[PDB]
């Protein structure tokens, strides 16, 4: 029962910690896409200029 409690606690903690990392991945990907759009916009500006 104690082994169950320990392993379950570890699983829960490691899962929530890496879920926070997954949210950081989502944020990073959003920022990446935003900057990609900015690059395309600026490239269009350079074309016209």
């Amino acid at each position: 029962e104690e082994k169950r409690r320990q392993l379950l606690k570890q699983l829960h903690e490691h899962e929530t910690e890496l879920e926070d990392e997954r949210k950081q991945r989502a944020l990073a990907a959003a920022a990446k896409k935003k900057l990609e759009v900015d690059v395309k916009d600026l490239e269009s500006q350079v074309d016209s200029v």
Partner: protein, 49 residues
């Protein structure tokens, strides 16, 4: 009581099959949605250009 157990386990299995199905369909629709959003962005920015 054993008959009711068997029925409860059958209902449980049915719900489990539908749960994993809906989860996979959700995943596929989310992936496809992200693709269509990217395609829309690519089309619209070039439309503006």
């Amino acid at each position: 009581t054993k008959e009711r157990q068997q029925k409860a386990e059958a209902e449980l299995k049915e719900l489990e099959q539908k749960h994993t199905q809906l989860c996979e369909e959700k995943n596929l629709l989310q992936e496809k949605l992200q693709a269509e959003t990217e395609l829309y962005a690519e089309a619209e920015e070039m439309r503006v250009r």
